[PDB]
From Swiss-Prot, chain B:
This is FACT complex subunit SPT16. Belongs to the peptidase M24 family. SPT16 subfamily. It is found in: Nucleus; Chromosome. It is linked to Neurodevelopmental disorder with dysmorphic facies and thin corpus callosum: An autosomal dominant disorder characterized by global developmental delay, impaired intellectual development with poor or absent speech and language, and autistic-like behaviors. Corpus callosum anomalies are visible on brain imaging. Most patients have dysmorphic features including tall forehead, down-slanting palpebral fissures, ear anomalies and broad nasal bridge. Other variably present clinical features include seizures, sleeping difficulties and precocious puberty. The modification Phosphothreonine is found at residue 248. ADP-ribosylated. ADP-ribosylation by PARP1 is induced by genotoxic stress and correlates with dissociation of FACT from chromatin. The chain holds residues 646 to 926 of 1047 of the full protein. Component of the FACT complex, a general chromatin factor that acts to reorganize nucleosomes. The FACT complex is involved in multiple processes that require DNA as a template such as mRNA elongation, DNA replication and DNA repair. During transcription elongation the FACT complex acts as a histone chaperone that both destabilizes and restores nucleosomal structure.
Curated annotation (Swiss-Prot), chain C:
It is found in: Nucleus; Chromosome. One of its GO terms (biological process) is gene expression. One of its GO terms (molecular function) is protein heterodimerization activity. The modification N6-succinyllysine is found at residues 22, 65. The modification N6,N6,N6-trimethyllysine is found at residue 22. It comes from the Eukaryota. The modification N6-lactoyllysine is found at residue 22. The modification Phosphothreonine is found at residues 23, 50. Signal peptide: none annotated. The modification N6-methyllysine is found at residues 7, 22, 65. This is Histone H3.1. The lineage of its organism: Eukaryota, Metazoa, Chordata, Craniata, Vertebrata. The modification Phosphoserine is found at residue 29. Belongs to the histone H3 family.
Swiss-Prot record, chain D:
This is Histone H3.1. The modification N6-(2-hydroxyisobutyryl)lysine is found at residues 5, 20, 63. The gene is H3C1. It is found in: Nucleus; Chromosome. It is linked to Glioma: Gliomas are benign or malignant central nervous system neoplasms derived from glial cells. They comprise astrocytomas and glioblastoma multiforme that are derived from astrocytes, oligodendrogliomas derived from oligodendrocytes and ependymomas derived from ependymocytes. The modification N6,N6,N6-trimethyllysine is found at residue 20. The chain holds residues 61 to 136 of 136 of the full protein. It comes from Homo sapiens. It comes from the Eukaryota.
UniProtKB/Swiss-Prot annotation, chain E:
Changing residue 8 to R: Abolished ufmylation. This is Histone H4. Changing residue 52 to R: In TEBIVANED4; results in severe early developmental defects when expressed in zebrafish embryos. The nucleosome is a histone octamer containing two molecules each of H2A, H2B, H3 and H4 assembled in one H3-H4 heterotetramer and two H2A-H2B heterodimers. The octamer wraps approximately 147 bp of DNA. Found in a co-chaperone complex with DNJC9, MCM2 and histone H3.3-H4 dimers. Within the complex, interacts with DNJC9 (via C-terminus); the interaction is direct. Interacts with NASP; NASP is a histone chaperone that stabilizes and maintains a soluble pool of Histone H3-H4 dimers. The chain holds residues 25 to 94 of 103 of the full protein. The modification N6-butyryllysine is found at residues 8, 21, 54, 56, 68. There is a cross-link at residues 8, 36, 56, 68 (Glycyl lysine isopeptide (Lys-Gly) (interchain with G-Cter in SUMO2)). It is found in: Nucleus; Chromosome. The modification N6-glutaryllysine is found at residues 8, 36, 54, 56, 68. It comes from Homo sapiens. The modification Phosphoserine is found at residue 24.
Length: 71, 271, 77, 76, 70
């Protein structure tokens, strides 16, 4: 599976625009894609850790926010 | 050092490559041109008539930088002897083509265009390379860097990506380029290696003690071990220290008394 | 609240990363939305640091060099 | 280890006059604050240095510190 | 005095350990100012731990906590 390819160039442009970026090099989409996958992986990894510490199979929004405090 | 004369032949076999910029330049304008492989050398045909020759027996290292992860694709030539064109003498001559573009603030069909040029360019380059290697009886070879062994550092007061090849530590995508022949290295010594430091400098000392040490600055600690592992696979010894050392003073001291330096136990002072 | 990323592809990304883990895992919609709200916030803030960097280099266009610098100072990997 | 202790605490006390306002610092703690600072400035300089490099400059300038601190989230 | 806790050579040593090759003359006051801000925030955060407990004397332990808030 490559679903990091599904997060879209226009999406990245949009996000960029909000960060106040005026102009963008071509390699930004792969970098951004990778940067995101790393970040996402950290939070999900940390998050499931709270989920099995409570002995659950289901990730609550609670798991996710506690994990973000670690980041 | 004077060169030999380019031997050019008129015939069916003339591997050529179009759409190539030449670093460094012949003016303050970028001279585009074409590169041609003749019997004993390389001819570069510029649009403006400016022509530069490079001899296969003058090539110290021949580098091929593909376009993967990059905005360009490069042929790099590290020369045994500096050759003169323009004002200065140049040990490093290379040829590149640009593959990438700049958006201002979803186009699909145009992305097929993208990968196809990237595919053309790098097929163009491989097919040329495969010829030239064959014309010399594999006696001249293009070394392609190992990107898995890469690391980021600041030799030149920019942060670039340095990559090992078989014979060299290399960056061909930034000008001035960075080429270091591994066979010529006495040892590596890492400085500012200590806990709570996110960056270390790496010091390259040459077998030829007259040559000033080459620094690679501000490399992330995470890369310290991968690098060490590579250094061993090269039989390049290394050492560590917290403090930054004065190498022009150390090299001065050694070159001025190469004998008594090895009476102290030599490089053991690095521990 | 704004959500510049389309929800569906973001979800596939979360469920892909959900393998390589407890192989049976489910996510609450609120949990996926939290992740999404977090990610877009991280990217925007990162893009601000990035743009500062390109300015520092006297450039208007951001390049991976800018991102990498920014992420390096922040302490990311 | 990297800074002289004497002028550093002259700064600690000069700061101490703004808080309780009667305060006296345990000697171990003055030492722990110096240790903490040294580390802070070193790591700051590491980020500063990277910023100078980004700008193709050997020398670091207050431009550089200010950028590092901005990205670190210290002063906007 | 005119030095706020840091002497010019100590600043150079610090920057040296950071990878700094060269120093604009303007750096000393920039470093000094920046240090006063970091030091204050940590002291400020520390004594609050000291008066959460009741003590008029700040200990090393009051400092370790001030730092885990940053």
């Amino acid at each position: 599976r490559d679903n990091i390819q599904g997060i879209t160039k226009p999406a990245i442009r949009r996000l960029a625009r909000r960060g106040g970026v005026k102009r963008i090099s071509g390699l930004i989409y792969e970098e951004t894609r990778g940067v995101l996958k790393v970040f996402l992986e950290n939070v999900i990894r940390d998050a499931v850790t709270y989920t099995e510490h409570a002995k659950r199979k289901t990730v609550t929004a609670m798991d996710v926010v506690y994990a973000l405090k670690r980041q | 050092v004077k060169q030999d004369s380019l031997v050019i032949n008129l015939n069916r076999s003339n591997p050529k490559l179009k759409d190539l910029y030449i670093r460094p330049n012949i003016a303050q304008k970028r001279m585009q041109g074409s590169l041609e492989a003749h019997v004993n050398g390389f001819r570069f045909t510029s649009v403006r008539g400016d022509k530069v020759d490079i001899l296969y027996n003058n090539i110290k290292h021949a580098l091929f930088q593909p376009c993967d992860g990059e905005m360009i694709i490069v042929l790099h030539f590290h020369l045994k002897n500096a050759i003169m064109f323009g004002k200065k003498r140049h040990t490093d001559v290379q040829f590149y083509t640009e593959v990438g573009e700049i958006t201002t603030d979803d186009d699909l069909y145009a992305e097929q265009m993208e990968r196809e040029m990237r595919h053309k360019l790098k097929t163009a380059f491989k097919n040329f390379i495969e010829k030239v290697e064959a014309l010399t009886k594999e006696e001249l070879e293009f070394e392609v860097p190992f990107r898995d062994l890469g690391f980021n550092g600041a030799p030149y007061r920019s942060t670039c990506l340095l990559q090992p090849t078989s014979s060299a530590l290399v960056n061909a995508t930034e000008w001035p380029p960075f080429v270091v022949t591994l066979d010529e290295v006495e040892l590596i010594h890492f400085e500012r290696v200590q806990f709570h430091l996110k960056n270390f400098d790496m010091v390259i000392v040459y077998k030829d003690y007259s040559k000033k040490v080459t620094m690679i600055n501000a490399i992330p600690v995470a890369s310290l071990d991968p690098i060490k592992e590579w250094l061993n696979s090269c039989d390049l010894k290394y050492t560590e220290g917290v403090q930054s050392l004065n190498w022009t003073k150390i090299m001065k001291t050694i070159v001025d008394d190469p004998e008594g330096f090895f009476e102290q136990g030599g490089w053991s002072f690095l521990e | 609240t704004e959500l510049l990323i389309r929800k569906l592809p973001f979800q596939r990304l979360v469920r892909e990363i959900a393998q390589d883990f407890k192989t049976d895992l489910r996510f609450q919609s609120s949990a996926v939305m939290a992740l999404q709200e977090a990610c877009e916030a991280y990217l925007v803030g990162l893009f601000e640091d990035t743009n500062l960097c390109a300015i520092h280099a006297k450039r208007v266009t951001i390049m991976p060099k800018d991102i990498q610098l920014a992420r390096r100072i922040r302490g990311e990997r």
